[PDB]
Design a protein around this ligand. Structure first.
Ligand SMILES: *[C@@H]1O[C@H](CO)[C@@H](O[C@@H]2O[C@H](CO)[C@@H](O[C@@H]3O[C@H](CO[C@H]4O[C@H](CO[C@H]5O[C@H](CO)[C@@H](O)[C@H](O)[C@@H]5O)[C@@H](O)[C@H](O)[C@@H]4O)[C@@H](O)[C@H](O[C@H]4O[C@H](CO[C@H]5O[C@H](CO)[C@@H](O)[C@H](O)[C@@H]5O)[C@@H](O)[C@H](O)[C@@H]4O)[C@@H]3O)[C@H](O)[C@H]2NC(C)=O)[C@H](O)[C@H]1NC(C)=O
Ligand SMILES: *[C@@H]1O[C@H](CO)[C@@H](O[C@@H]2O[C@H](CO)[C@@H](O[C@@H]3O[C@H](CO[C@H]4O[C@H](CO[C@H]5O[C@H](CO)[C@@H](O)[C@H](O)[C@@H]5O)[C@@H](O)[C@H](O)[C@@H]4O)[C@@H](O)[C@H](O[C@H]4O[C@H](CO[C@H]5O[C@H](CO)[C@@H](O)[C@H](O)[C@@H]5O)[C@@H](O)[C@H](O)[C@@H]4O)[C@@H]3O)[C@H](O)[C@H]2NC(C)=O)[C@H](O)[C@H]1NC(C)=O
Ligand SMILES: *[C@@H]1O[C@H](CO)[C@@H](O[C@@H]2O[C@H](CO)[C@@H](O[C@@H]3O[C@H](CO[C@H]4O[C@H](CO[C@H]5O[C@H](CO)[C@@H](O)[C@H](O)[C@@H]5O)[C@@H](O)[C@H](O)[C@@H]4O)[C@@H](O)[C@H](O[C@H]4O[C@H](CO[C@H]5O[C@H](CO)[C@@H](O)[C@H](O)[C@@H]5O)[C@@H](O)[C@H](O)[C@@H]4O)[C@@H]3O)[C@H](O)[C@H]2NC(C)=O)[C@H](O)[C@H]1NC(C)=O
Ligand SMILES: *[C@@H]1O[C@H](CO)[C@@H](O[C@@H]2O[C@H](CO)[C@@H](O[C@@H]3O[C@H](CO[C@H]4O[C@H](CO[C@H]5O[C@H](CO)[C@@H](O)[C@H](O)[C@@H]5O)[C@@H](O)[C@H](O)[C@@H]4O)[C@@H](O)[C@H](O[C@H]4O[C@H](CO[C@H]5O[C@H](CO)[C@@H](O)[C@H](O)[C@@H]5O)[C@@H](O)[C@H](O)[C@@H]4O)[C@@H]3O)[C@H](O)[C@H]2NC(C)=O)[C@H](O)[C@H]1NC(C)=O
Ligand SMILES: *[C@@H]1O[C@H](CO)[C@@H](O[C@@H]2O[C@H](CO)[C@@H](O)[C@H](O)[C@H]2NC(C)=O)[C@H](O)[C@H]1NC(C)=O
Ligand SMILES: *[C@@H]1O[C@H](CO)[C@@H](O[C@@H]2O[C@H](CO)[C@@H](O)[C@H](O)[C@H]2NC(C)=O)[C@H](O)[C@H]1NC(C)=O
Ligand SMILES: *[C@@H]1O[C@H](CO)[C@@H](O[C@@H]2O[C@H](CO)[C@@H](O)[C@H](O)[C@H]2NC(C)=O)[C@H](O)[C@H]1NC(C)=O
Ligand SMILES: *[C@@H]1O[C@H](CO)[C@@H](O[C@@H]2O[C@H](CO)[C@@H](O)[C@H](O)[C@H]2NC(C)=O)[C@H](O)[C@H]1NC(C)=O
Lengths: 257, 257, 257, 257
């Protein structure tokens, strides 16, 4: 028939009923007692007109009894409800209880910042990233060629490329900047024929075609095979590469005039 | 206080300290952390007992930072050194870094051998090497005589020689094999008096003496002058020479009996 | 397809091709190498625009090889022909060689003129040329008569002549200048009858006729026989002759008035 | 130093030296040349071992030169003397020449004997030789007596003789054979007194004496004068004479008993 506002703070229990009792149960005048009848109710106004009692959550200050469990401390008492000093039709009692946990967690809000003497040691060094080169037997760059020598007719079409195996593959593209054939295993020699001379292919010779350079970890290009004029019989391939920053630079070169 | 083993490969950085920390710093138990504290150290055994961490040379996989220059990519992180979960006397930190060049050079190891159609043209011919002869005015073979005729008494002593001027002087010695006087400018005539007849001088006549033949580019010999008996008045000198292989033959002849 | 100019001197070999290669083989630009590729060609102009190389005829200065025979020293090398640093359709090579004889003949050009003391001996003497005379039995002067005496009637016709047997027959004609009969074997005697008196016959007597005198080696004439008047019985014939220069004189006399 | 044998025939000149050159000039071996050096010497043996050359007496067959004069044809050449093919101490030359006359005399040796018709005329006659007689006035027969008559006393002594004047005085002596006195001029008369009767005087008469008869051209005798007895007065003398062959006869008579 009635609403029930129960609040429990750390120090005291409060219990109240509203102005619903102005009509409900016919309570023209309202009495409210706890088990110690010296503790009577009053009329609060902070939120609404409320009829209420207040009892400390202690053993016995208004007769309240404390039940003790492993998980909680429980306090209990009873409101007695009446419209008169004496009653004759219905003994109305509101039995109420509330509990508190005994297990809780806490923390300091101040952060502590320590300071300490310190020793600073430095060391340092260097290393390199593996790059390799390969010649292919097949159009689609697919197939390995291991042999320490390959013989070809001059009508044959080499396919070739370079690969970045080492690491940091998202940051560095493999960019060829210079690539050339020599008649010697020493890569420094006075006679060079150029396929890629300055970040661009030597497209003046129509038999050179480039597939991919600077966009990935594996560069690809192709050219018809040839023989050095003069008293020569072997062809060696040498090139120069550069690890190109994929974040702070355009790595794909423009080859034009 | 401590040694430092730093290795950098193409994929990962490794950093280690040895069992020197078994006594040094009192590290009964050893902790080792990088800037991402989820990456902790371990105990390696491939060479010695080493305490070490391993981090890929990438952006951030254990908090490692990459600094970028024009000449190098540099990676850096820090070891934290401790004997306990918590510390109180010295914050020990090892700051380390290593770098990699961005400019590198590469090569193919396979040699390429081309084949090609060929055209073969031959030509050929012949030539000769200049040899000359001279008469001298003086003992030491020194002096020229240009004149188109020389008059001498019969008490006079001619000095004469031949010279190889043409070329290939290290391979061919000038060897006289035959030399004779005629009463005529035609060198073929029926009357001959011999100075050198068959690779040797006609030493039967005591007035002939040879200096050098077959050892050099200039041969030398001498003989008292004479007149052809009969109705004759002029003397002409003619000889035959041979270019002698200094490598595959003894060129100095032996004149004996 | 091409001409070939090969010259070999005593010191160096020269080899060249002309401007035929301006169109031939499409050689827009011309490369020319020997087996040592450091020796390259050049553009000569002394006769025409020629493309050429020059190599000393030695062992190895541009890789040239020397083959040695008994008769010759032979040098050989190869031109490599190309229109580009590198080639792809035809390896064009010109193989060339030239040789030199090892056996040669030489001479001094100065003539030598000796002088010598001399001894001069003279001797000298004299001699004579045989001439003979004959009487003939027959008209055509043909027949010999040996007999130490011949008897004739006075109606008989002697035929007579003289002959030059001795020598120098082209230079000397036999010329009779005087001829006469005596009554004695002494040829000097006071009585003479003349047939030929002074380079001419005594034609006043009609019985004398001359055939040939001064034109040949055998003179001929005839006269009817006769007897000396008086106490005489024998006839002897005597004559005088002269050897006439056939080169510096007319030998045929003119007999007239 | 050397002898020189020079002979010249009608056809050829010969010139030689002997074995004196075996020691002289040291000519161990002997060379001998003329001006045409193709004509060399040889070793003759017909008389001795001689070294010699032979050249026809013509223009140029071994280079010999002919000089022509009015009196002679002269030929000249030179020997060259040597002990070797070539010489050095003395050029030895023998200059020689010989000549032939151009004027010569010749004869036929056959004698010619003519025969001829002949005419024979004879004539003939006779003559006489003058003899005379004389009377003398004086003892020595000396004096003439011309007178046509002489008177004498009878004591007188006539002297008388005869003379042969005519001729042939060497062949004929005048021989008186008969002589007598007559008393008459007719010499035939019957009375004769004889002085010489028969080749002898009538010496019985002591007054007759004969001087010379038959030995010469003049006979002589004498007798005392006398007169014929009887009638007579004149005395005449007559005699008979005979021409006596002085070659085939004794002409002096012997008068005896
Ligand atoms: C130690 O001691 C402590 C302190 O006593 C014990 O902790 C307490 O345990 C109690 C028992 O579980 C909790 O009580 C409540 O029990 C109700 C069940 O019984 C009542 O309801 C039945 C109705 O359900 C029945 O339906 C039919 C019949 O109708 C049956 O056939 C059927 O079988 C059902 O049982 C009645 O029949 C019965 O007679 C009882 O009257 C639960 O319903 C109740 O659940 C409530 O949970 C919360 C409580 O409010 C809090 O949360 C809300 C969240 O929105 C918040 O708004 C509030 O302000 C509160 O903070 C609400 O959702 C409802 O009110 C539910 O009804 C309870 O379970 C005590 O709550 C509990 N005390 C606590 C936790 O502080 C502890 O168990 C002991 N330890 C031991 C024994 O080891
Ligand atoms: C782009 O970015 C790249 C990457 O960072 C740059 O390349 C780096 O340049 C750095 C600067 O030159 C190099 O660092 C090292 O610098 C040292 C100098 O400073 C330190 O040392 C001083 C001591 O010397 C001083 O003495 C007194 C005081 O004591 C002073 O008064 C005096 O003036 C001196 O300065 C300290 O004072 C100072 O505070 C610093 O601590 C150099 O000594 C050092 O040289 C070392 O060189 C090699 C390195 O090891 C390699 O080679 C050996 C060969 O045997 C091999 O064994 C190893 O394994 C390595 O391969 C060793 O011989 C010694 O360790 C030397 O000490 C350096 O020069 C970086 O090394 C360099 N990084 C490279 C090259 O990868 C680049 O310059 C930038 N590009 C620009 C700016 O254009
Ligand atoms: C020691 O070593 C010396 C140096 O090598 C030797 O001397 C050399 O001997 C060589 C061999 O004889 C000479 O070579 C030349 O050989 C040619 C023959 O073979 C080539 O030709 C054949 C064609 O003839 C064939 O026809 C058919 C097929 O087509 C066959 O069925 C047939 O049987 C024929 O063989 C090819 O088949 C063959 O494969 C070869 O290619 C000769 O023809 C050549 O003669 C040339 O002679 C002169 C050379 O030029 C000089 O003279 C001219 C004169 O006008 C002048 O103008 C030049 O400037 C030169 O001065 C030319 O008239 C032509 O060019 C001829 O073709 C040769 O005979 C070498 O020449 C020779 N080297 C000399 C001499 O310096 C020597 O023999 C060795 N001693 C030994 C072994 O004892
Ligand atoms: C036409 O051409 C013909 C042919 O040439 C001419 O005939 C020739 O004339 C020549 C000149 O007369 C004759 O030559 C001989 O000349 C000698 C003289 O000169 C040489 O001798 C001198 C020595 O005498 C000198 O002494 C001192 C110095 O020492 C002086 O001071 C002095 O004044 C003297 O000159 C040298 O000085 C001089 O340099 C010359 O060397 C004559 O001596 C020589 O007489 C020789 O006569 C005969 C020759 O031999 C023949 O006869 C002998 C008889 O027994 C016989 O045995 C031989 O077999 C020969 O048949 C010998 O008795 C001696 O040998 C004498 O020395 C000559 O007179 C040529 O003989 C002569 N040729 C003939 C004749 O065939 C002709 O004259 C021309 N017609 C003209 C010009 O009209
Ligand atoms: C590569 O080849 C060269 C010769 O072609 C070798 O020699 C070097 O050549 C360069 C110029 O081409 C010179 O600057 C050096 O001084 C030379 N070095 C020597 C040691 O001579 C060179 O050594 C070769 N490289 C190798 C074999 O790795
Ligand atoms: C050299 O002289 C000779 C004559 O002495 C010249 O004639 C040749 O002689 C040889 C034998 O000596 C013969 O086999 C040849 O047939 C001759 N040739 C002629 C053309 O007659 C020879 O010509 C001279 N050489 C020269 C002038 O160079
Ligand atoms: C030739 O006959 C004459 C006589 O008729 C010989 O005598 C010579 O005669 C010439 C004159 O006729 C004189 O000048 C000489 O003096 C004479 N010589 C002598 C020696 O008397 C002459 O000898 C005869 N010739 C001969 C025989 O050969
Ligand atoms: C000489 O005298 C006589 C006479 O005495 C002459 O007469 C001759 O005499 C001889 C005899 O005596 C006779 O035989 C002759 O016959 C006589 N001749 C004549 C002619 O009578 C004689 O004639 C006288 N002579 C003279 C004169 O001369």
């Amino acid at each position: 028939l009635l609403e029930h506002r129960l609040e429990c703070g750390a120090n005291d229990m409060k219990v109240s009923l509203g102005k619903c009792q102005l009509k409900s149960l016919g309570f023209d005048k309202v009495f409210m007692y706890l088990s110690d009848s010296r503790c009577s109710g009053f009329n609060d106004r902070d939120n609404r007109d409320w009829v209420s009692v207040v009892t400390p959550a202690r053993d016995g200050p208004c007769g309240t009894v404390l039940t003790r469990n492993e998980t909680h401390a429980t306090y209990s008492n009873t409101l007695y409800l009446a419209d008169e000093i004496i009653i004759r039709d219905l003994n109305i009692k509101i039995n109420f209880a509330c509990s508190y946990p005994l297990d809780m967690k806490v923390s300091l809000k101040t952060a502590l910042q320590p300071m300490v003497s310190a020793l600073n040691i430095r060391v340092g060094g260097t290393g390199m990233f593996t790059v390799r080169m390969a010649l292919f037997q097949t159009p689609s760059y697919t197939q390995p060629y291991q042999g320490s020598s390959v013989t070809l007719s001059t009508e044959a079409f080499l396919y070739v490329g370079t690969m970045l195996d080492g690491g940091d593959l998202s940051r560095f593209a493999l960019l060829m900047t210079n690539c050339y054939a020599t008649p010697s295993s020493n890569a420094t020699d006075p006679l060079k024929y150029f396929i890629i001379q300055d970040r661009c292919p030597h497209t003046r010779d129509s038999t050179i075609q480039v597939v991919e350079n600077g966009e990935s970890s594996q560069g690809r290009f192709s050219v018809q095979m040839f023989r050095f004029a003069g008293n020569y019989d072997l062809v060696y391939l040498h090139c120069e590469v550069y690890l190109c920053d994929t974040m702070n630079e355009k790595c794909k070169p423009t080859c034009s005039g």
